[PDB]
Amino acid sequence: MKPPQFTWAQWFETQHINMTSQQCTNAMQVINNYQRRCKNQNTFLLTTFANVVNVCGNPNMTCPSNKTRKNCHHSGSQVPLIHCNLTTPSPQNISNCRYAQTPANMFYIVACDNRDQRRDPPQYPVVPVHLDRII
Ligand SMILES: Nc1ncnc2c1ncn2[C@@H]1O[C@H](COP(=O)(O)O)[C@@H](O)[C@H]1O
């Protein structure tokens, strides 16, 4: 449930790269306010968008969360990440959702696709579109 103004890569960045606060409850307001639902789980990779695009250059692998897909790519090393867990669901009032935060150093697996021709910048022809797994 991506908001229509974002490409998949832009939505990927919004959910997994641009952690607007080191505190999950604050950071998740962005994601939840965009998708009009409190996400149960969300990982913020403490890495850069360009770093992930280079992970898209790594050898293709089966997506562990989406077995029929072969458009995934494994990071060559562990990266710091913050994982946000829903601790206070609030379906009838998104703004009151609260999260716990778990810091960790793990690998990630991203699905990558060619860029949205009209809205994604030419600079990156291949872009991350889904965070398939942290492992
Ligand atoms: N064009 C795309 N190719 C692959 N995955 C995509 C694409 N657009 C969105 N996704 C993400 O891919 C996930 C799983 O795709 P699938 O394996 O086909 O079910 C979804 O949860 C989406 O977030």
Swiss-Prot record:
Keywords: Chemotaxis, Disulfide bond, Endonuclease, Glycoprotein, Hydrolase, Lyase, Lysosome, Nitration, Nuclease, Signal
Disulfide cysteine pairs (residue numbers): 24-84, 38-97, 56-112, 63-72
Catalysed reaction equations from the record: an [RNA] containing cytidine + H2O = an [RNA]-3'-cytidine-3'-phosphate + a 5'-hydroxy-ribonucleotide-3'-[RNA]; an [RNA] containing uridine + H2O = an [RNA]-3'-uridine-3'-phosphate + a 5'-hydroxy-ribonucleotide-3'-[RNA]
EC code(s) of this entry: 4.6.1.18
Claim: Transcription is one of the keywords in the record: no
Binding site for substrate: 39-43
UniProt-recorded Gene Ontology molecular function terms: lyase activity; nucleic acid binding; ribonuclease A activity; RNA nuclease activity
Residue positions of the active site: 16, 130
List of glycosylated residues: 8, 18, 60, 66, 85, 93
3'-nitrotyrosine: residues carrying this PTM: 34
Oxidoreductase among keywords: no
GO terms (BP aspect): chemotaxis; defense response to virus; innate immune response in mucosa; RNA catabolic process
Post-translational modification comment from the UniProt entry: A particular signal processing and glycosylation pattern may differentiate the UpI2 RNase, found specifically in pregnant women urine, from other nonsecretory RNases.
Primary subcellular site in the record, as a coarse category: other
Assembly mode: Interacts with and forms a tight 1:1 complex with RNH1. Dimerization of two such complexes may occur.
Family: Belongs to the pancreatic ribonuclease family.
Biological role stated in the UniProt entry: This is a non-secretory ribonuclease. It is a pyrimidine specific nuclease with a slight preference for U. Cytotoxin and helminthotoxin. Selectively chemotactic for dendritic cells. Possesses a wide variety of biological activities.
Domain notes: The N-terminal region is necessary for mediating chemotactic activity.
Protein name as it appears in the record: Non-secretory ribonuclease
Designated gene of the protein: RNASE2
Span of the entire protein shown here: 28 to 161 of 161
